[PDB]
Design a protein around this ligand. Sequence first.
Ligand SMILES: Nc1ncnc2c1ncn2[C@@H]1O[C@H](COP(=O)(O)OP(=O)(O)O)[C@@H](O)[C@H]1O
Ligand SMILES: Nc1ncnc2c1ncn2[C@@H]1O[C@H](COP(=O)(O)OP(=O)(O)O)[C@@H](O)[C@H]1O
Ligand SMILES: Nc1ncnc2c1ncn2[C@@H]1O[C@H](COP(=O)(O)OP(=O)(O)O)[C@@H](O)[C@H]1O
Ligand SMILES: Nc1ncnc2c1ncn2[C@@H]1O[C@H](COP(=O)(O)OP(=O)(O)O)[C@@H](O)[C@H]1O
Ligand SMILES: [Mg+2]
Ligand SMILES: [Mg+2]
Ligand SMILES: [Mg+2]
Ligand SMILES: [Mg+2]
Lengths: 477, 477, 477, 477
Amino acid sequence: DAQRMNILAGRIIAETVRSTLGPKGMDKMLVDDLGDVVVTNDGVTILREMSVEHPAAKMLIEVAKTQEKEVGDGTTTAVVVAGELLRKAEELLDQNVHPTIVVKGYQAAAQKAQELLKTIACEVGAQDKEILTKIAMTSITGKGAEKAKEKLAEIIVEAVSAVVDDEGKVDKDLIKIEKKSGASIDDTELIKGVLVDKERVSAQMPKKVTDAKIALLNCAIEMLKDMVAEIKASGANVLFCQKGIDDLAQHYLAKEGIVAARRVKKSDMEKLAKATGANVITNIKDLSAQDLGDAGLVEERKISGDSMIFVEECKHPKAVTMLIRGTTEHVIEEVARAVDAAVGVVGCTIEDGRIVSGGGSTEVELSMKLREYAEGISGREQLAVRAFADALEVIPRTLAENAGLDAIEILVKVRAAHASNGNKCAGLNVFTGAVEDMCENGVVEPLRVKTQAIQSAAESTEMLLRIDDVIAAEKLR
Amino acid sequence: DAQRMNILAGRIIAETVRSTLGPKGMDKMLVDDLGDVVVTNDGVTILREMSVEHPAAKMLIEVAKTQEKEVGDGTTTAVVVAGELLRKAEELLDQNVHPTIVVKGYQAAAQKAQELLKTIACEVGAQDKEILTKIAMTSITGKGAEKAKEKLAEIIVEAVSAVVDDEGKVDKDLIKIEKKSGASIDDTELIKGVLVDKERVSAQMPKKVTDAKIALLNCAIEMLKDMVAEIKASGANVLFCQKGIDDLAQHYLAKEGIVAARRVKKSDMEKLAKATGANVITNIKDLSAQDLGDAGLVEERKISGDSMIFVEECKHPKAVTMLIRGTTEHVIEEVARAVDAAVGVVGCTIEDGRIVSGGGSTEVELSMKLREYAEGISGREQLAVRAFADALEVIPRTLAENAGLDAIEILVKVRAAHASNGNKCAGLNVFTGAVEDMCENGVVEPLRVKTQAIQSAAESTEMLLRIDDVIAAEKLR
Amino acid sequence: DAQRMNILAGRIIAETVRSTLGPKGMDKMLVDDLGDVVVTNDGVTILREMSVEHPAAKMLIEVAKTQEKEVGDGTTTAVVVAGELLRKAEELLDQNVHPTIVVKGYQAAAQKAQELLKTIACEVGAQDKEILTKIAMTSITGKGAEKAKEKLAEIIVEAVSAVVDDEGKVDKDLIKIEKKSGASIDDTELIKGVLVDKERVSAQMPKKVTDAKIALLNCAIEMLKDMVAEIKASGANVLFCQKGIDDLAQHYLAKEGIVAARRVKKSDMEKLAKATGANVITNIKDLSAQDLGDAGLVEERKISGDSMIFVEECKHPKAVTMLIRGTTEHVIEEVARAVDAAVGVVGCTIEDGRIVSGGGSTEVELSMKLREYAEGISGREQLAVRAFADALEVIPRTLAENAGLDAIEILVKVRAAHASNGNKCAGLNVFTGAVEDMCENGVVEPLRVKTQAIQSAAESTEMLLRIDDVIAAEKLR
Amino acid sequence: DAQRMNILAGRIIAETVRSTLGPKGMDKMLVDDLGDVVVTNDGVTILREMSVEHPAAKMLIEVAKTQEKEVGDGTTTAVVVAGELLRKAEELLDQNVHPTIVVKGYQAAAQKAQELLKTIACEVGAQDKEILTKIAMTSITGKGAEKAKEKLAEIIVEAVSAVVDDEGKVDKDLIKIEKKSGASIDDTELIKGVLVDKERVSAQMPKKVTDAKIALLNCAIEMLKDMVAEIKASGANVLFCQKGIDDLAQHYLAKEGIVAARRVKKSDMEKLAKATGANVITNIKDLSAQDLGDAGLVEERKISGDSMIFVEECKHPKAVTMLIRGTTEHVIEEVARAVDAAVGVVGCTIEDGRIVSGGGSTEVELSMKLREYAEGISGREQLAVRAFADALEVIPRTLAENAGLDAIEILVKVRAAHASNGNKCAGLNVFTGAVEDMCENGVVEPLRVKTQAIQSAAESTEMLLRIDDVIAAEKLR
Ligand SMILES: Nc1ncnc2c1ncn2[C@@H]1O[C@H](COP(=O)(O)OP(=O)(O)O)[C@@H](O)[C@H]1O
Ligand SMILES: Nc1ncnc2c1ncn2[C@@H]1O[C@H](COP(=O)(O)OP(=O)(O)O)[C@@H](O)[C@H]1O
Ligand SMILES: Nc1ncnc2c1ncn2[C@@H]1O[C@H](COP(=O)(O)OP(=O)(O)O)[C@@H](O)[C@H]1O
Ligand SMILES: Nc1ncnc2c1ncn2[C@@H]1O[C@H](COP(=O)(O)OP(=O)(O)O)[C@@H](O)[C@H]1O
Ligand SMILES: [Mg+2]
Ligand SMILES: [Mg+2]
Ligand SMILES: [Mg+2]
Ligand SMILES: [Mg+2]
């Protein structure tokens, strides 16, 4: 009774982002209380912006937060599978199956799914840039752009492959994301170093400094003669002032051949302190030759529509930065979420070396094998394993729904292609309407995406099914 | 629309006799317009006594008439499977599957069922009286009596085995059914020959005649001296007059040592003409010594409550007669329908030599194998093949329902016993509640029972699905 | 207003037989006031059996009566197109198009359809038995039997080809249809001559007569010696008496070696007078040696279930008779309607020598060409020509509907195959689900089928659109 | 469901300005919350003044803002086509066509429309003043004045042709728009230079100065003797003070033969700095002989109702200014929007050299060619391309509706005139009621008008169709 409304609340959250799955997915319209409009195909964006107050709905959201924290992609996939599991479980409750039996079936079916996924996955090499590019292609194109990814995917593959340490681990904090308005999306490029979105405050100043000694000054300049003497004595050639710089000081800086920029953002003072290794000085007497950062090259090179300072050839950091360019602000914010997703799947591929074919092909193969495993189960426990397998068909059907095809006959032909030692990679290519080999089409995604999503969907539904009543408590906590 | 109510009418006829399946089946109460009450477990009895006016209902009844004409048992099974097919097909219509696709699926699944049944069936020898007894045991005990069949089954096995010609064919008209009230049911016995429920019209007449010359007279006797001269000249010792015999003629018949009975029924004049080989004479001049029948013994022996004429030791006919004894009239009529059913299954076993294990095991094994065949089908045609396999589960579930068990978990454990090269004969034994090997329990039925019923259920449902509207015609015919 | 209900009444008659189109057509159930049931796929049977009282409905039925009288097939096609024309016309009335403009458009579009059909049709030779077999195959298989036609079609092709006179005309009365119950449908055969469903009244009579002299006697026999003298003097060896024959006359007829049959039907006296060329004598003195018919062989040969007199090897008549065999009465009556249809289309093919590809391919090709012709029309008259073209798509759509496919995308792919100098014979093969060349599949039908159906559909709808009110008259006639 | 109301909101915005299309367009009445009344035929004026709160309505308005920013004309055409696309798409949704299929059809049909437009357009010479006059005639006369354009169009053609640089590009900021109340509309004239709506502060001052040295003074005058010495030493003859001028300074300025005006607007200080090339001095010591601007003539000539300073014969700027005259304020504001529109179409003509015939002729020709392209499409994707072609007919129909004619037969005769390679420029001349060659009537518009409008209408509808639900978000942004 009161238990069912929890199942209802969970399915409501699922069907909210249901139609946003896959490249041909539908866009949702987000409207706040102030009348601002947001249109997006990304599932996790919709999940965080929703006005979610129901507890069972929040218990489901923690799957997407967990799925994105541990993988970065598949949050839409995990939520939809959880919703379909709740629907199939409600059907079994309507057949007088006790909830604990459904949980025992789901729990046993989730473990068997993990073992089967470990055998379906194909092994790849952490140096195969082609397979890594196909992984990024599949992960980004689910949002809604074609062939522009081919340039961005190779940029992301080169960025991640550079920050891979000698242990095969990928630290996403080593790849800084930088967002700036520009002329077009294609202007997005990768830079071996760090970026400063400023220009020389005086054109007479020298524009390039090699073997730079970076100085981070947090005090305004606008007494002053002794300040210039102390800074010049520290043996520095590059100065970054967070506040302003005196116009008379900008002259003596240009005469001494010293590049300097004022109005430097607080974020640039933080990244220079973290990367190059400088302190944020609070008193000019503290500035020394050791607080300076080291950099092989500091060059301000213009770009399409803007001029900014590039700090390249820094051997000490071993890190890179993504310069994201775009026309509008919402386009840039959409491109940023595409990079965060591709970084996750490429990172998971290098760490795990296990991938499966996408397009719902792996789901169908897993569904068929689980129905075989269900046959051998005695006791009511079997019916839950059946539903768990038939629940996985929600992923290929939703893809066919959003592709405009008849999900019934599409799901039929794919099941036929997998039947009796078929092609475990046969799926629906939403661009052609035919059933093809997803591996030959370059549609692949990491194994951790599927394993983490399925386990996350199972554990949440198991948690909801153990709830049979909600009780009005007082105070607590 | 108007099509669906036809499907509804069929399921109504199905669910009417649904709970009458199996030995533990439920009894139905038949009440006419005059207030007479009839309680029975036999399905075909209920089907003919129903006030059936709907055309789709009549189209369903013709399956039971065909099933009983071609087999004699399994009419309940064919009707129930037809109803479950109608229910599963209605589900597919509710999923926007066109009727012709369902027909194509059912039609292709019915043919695959015939091929699979031909491989599940076990071969037996036409002389194995033990297996023939187990066949009769299974067919009769479905009505509602225990271990009394063991005596009757061996009587039926000996009766059928005697009339088997040199071509393995069984003519049910060679086994005459005779019903007479008596002391108990156990008094039912088999007689090697034919019976005449008459007595000597004169006690002074000789009661026994050996090497009898049977005479069939169709003319009343009550000129007359020339009639006695012609009949005595024909060289006959036994006379059967359909009409009466003169009292003065009854005297000269008793004096000459000639046994004679008057008021002989028309059925006895037919069976004597068919068995012993005599003509029905219409003019006394046609009576000759060749129109006489031959019989080794003609003896009138009294029985409990009656005296009648037995004609035994007739090597020429090669036919026998069943003497049915019972307490009441309704009990005898129930025993007669048990014999007509057992005669059919024993006859089908000797002619075909193919039997299958009961208990729903053949249905479950066929259902499981058909779900495997459905996997390889592309196009919407697959979904009908799925439903056709899952429709067969109505037979084991109804047995479990009528046995008082939980049909869900019973059907689960049986499917587990058949899964992955299991025991094709594993079913639910309604007397113990456990799943056992039906072959080891002696629960077997002929192959023609299953093949004819399944094909009959498919063809009727196929015929109903091609109907999409009923039109108000005028006159016609 | 009152005009529209006429359009409604016509569409009701159309959609009544709509789903009966094509081989995969649906079956309708006809129920009279007495409860008798008739299930059929044939459209014209349903049209005559309907309880039709509405005048506009009767005005539509006369199209099927006209289509069947002048062609024999396509009555369902003409009715459905007429109904679709009425629907498209109702749309134009709802756009404030005057009925006479719709008529002017329909009338101008119907004539242009005749011009295009004359150029789409392919020419065949009146001696090409292969193409004639494909014509009969296509026309019969629309009812619901497979490959049994291949034997029956060649029988029908040989029957029609024999009665073709030296002017290419086919008289359907020269091919007698004979219906008799038998063992199976395959026993249907063609006989080179005429048939008499009688047997020799005396088995002692000689059973065979060669070089027969047929005599037609209309006077009862049962004076008599002078009658035998006059008949024997006329020089006849075969006598057909419509009334009875004296038993003593049956003796003297059998002694003279003269075959004779009594109780001969009136239909047999008519066909013998028409074929062999004999007179129906009304006075024994009129019987002469010249009133006799000539026949090479008269033989009474038994068949499965009956014995009858065959009159073969008659060179003079030039006519044949179809012996229809079947299991039940309704099956035979269904086979008879198939022959009458095939005779019509084969006759239309030999007379015209023009055929078009079936399957709806010709309809789509005609529809596409009419939309091109519609473009060049000025004034509101154009809109009707558009509707006339888009109305023809009802035939391929109904075939796709009855085949279980999605009529939308099937109709799309066919239009694509015909577009920009495509294949004018590309249609939907309901047996495979793919679009194929209908000529290569052997699916063809005579040009007169299409031309007469389209003109019949147009003229009736033209007649309905000129009706704008119904007036309550008195007496009249 | 919730998606459909978005389609509804867009069509509401479309039909709001629907009847304002073409010269015979209808006037709309705008009433604010204060009771002020505005009557206009201009579509873009109505679109910005509407109380638009619905998001889907705003998403549609952004098309008119985009169309006006990139072209300047066709905003009404793009909105109406967008609305008609939404209506035709709703019909396809009511036929169970998935939105992504409609988008795929629209997207593919929009690209084919761009390619077809590139071949329909005729090339013109950037020096052909006659064709440029016909372009301005067609663009302005859509608002509501006759033959007054012939004088204004030639004025606009001369203004744009003067500011065309050596690269064929037209910078609209080089043509300054000046609005002033006057005696009549015909007093609108073009001035080769820049305008200053000021008069001499002293009538005793000389009114004309040749070889002027423009001085821009930003400091108030009202020490003062040294200020006059520094300005006179700089060698200047014309002074523009943004603030006031001392009355005693106004005396010494009049004695030296120096023209001076005080209270000069900030816009005049900006335009003089941009055109003549002068600096805005902030300290009298910075004024030099090089900060002065150069001008061949500075003359204050009175006009009907006012006197102002004209700065003509300035070879250096290469820019001109439009003096707009009118009776009332609202009349002047309407004339200004006419010039901005004509400047856009004349500019697009010189840059592109591609024009198409107006009157809906290009729309009909594009509609007919797209229906030919639609024929060859397989799969449901075709149906959207059909609707896209039939959607373009909204433009000729709306013109015929506003012209008072029967849109049905007018659209018919135009389609007939275009059918099978008709006159691709045949359209409806709303002044005569007949179908004529629009090129021979001087009804032409640039290619960029159609290409940008069609693409803008398609992309917006594509964006609306990807929306399937609106979600209640919290906070965001
Ligand atoms: N080219 C493609 N063909 C078929 N399926 C695809 C393709 N690209 C992506 N997908 C599917 O889209 C799904 C993910 O899409 P999306 O919802 O955008 O991201 P998320 O992984 O967060 O759910 C994956 O399961 C994948 O199978
Ligand atoms: N001892 C038993 N255990 C399990 N099933 C049985 C047993 N005896 C009979 N059956 C089942 O009963 C079914 C037939 O029973 P019943 O309805 O009485 O006759 P009918 O064949 O006319 O329907 C068979 O399909 C068989 O599988
Ligand atoms: N093998 C076939 N494949 C496709 N269409 C067929 C085939 N055979 C017959 N048809 C179609 O069936 C239609 C006629 O069927 P039916 O309604 O039974 O007879 P009628 O010609 O009286 O309407 C024809 O228009 C023909 O195109
Ligand atoms: N003289 C004319 N004859 C026929 N049509 C015209 C004429 N002048 C303009 N039009 C039509 O009017 C349409 C534009 O009118 P309007 O709505 O006033 O401006 P906008 O271009 O902003 O929509 C063009 O599509 C053009 O075809
Ligand atoms: Mg993704
Ligand atoms: Mg039974
Ligand atoms: Mg036909
Ligand atoms: Mg305009």
